[PDB]
Amino acid sequence: MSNSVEALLEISSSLKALKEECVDLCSSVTDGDKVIQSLRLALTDFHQLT
């Protein structure tokens, strides 16, 4: 029992520390798929212009 409780306290602390480091990653799910499409077009144009 005493070993299990100590393991919970350690993992909980590690999670709290990682969530704080990842504050910028947690914002609004803009449709990742749309950004990639747009990027695809821009790169393709860039290549053609070069």
């Binding site: 990653l25 803009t30 990742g32 950004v35 747009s38 990027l39 821009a42």
Partner: peptide, 10 residues
């Protein structure tokens, strides 16, 4: 992979 960083590159 994240939209934020990909947006800046665009």
């Amino acid at each position: 992979t994240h939209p934020l960083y990909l947006g800046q590159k665009h």
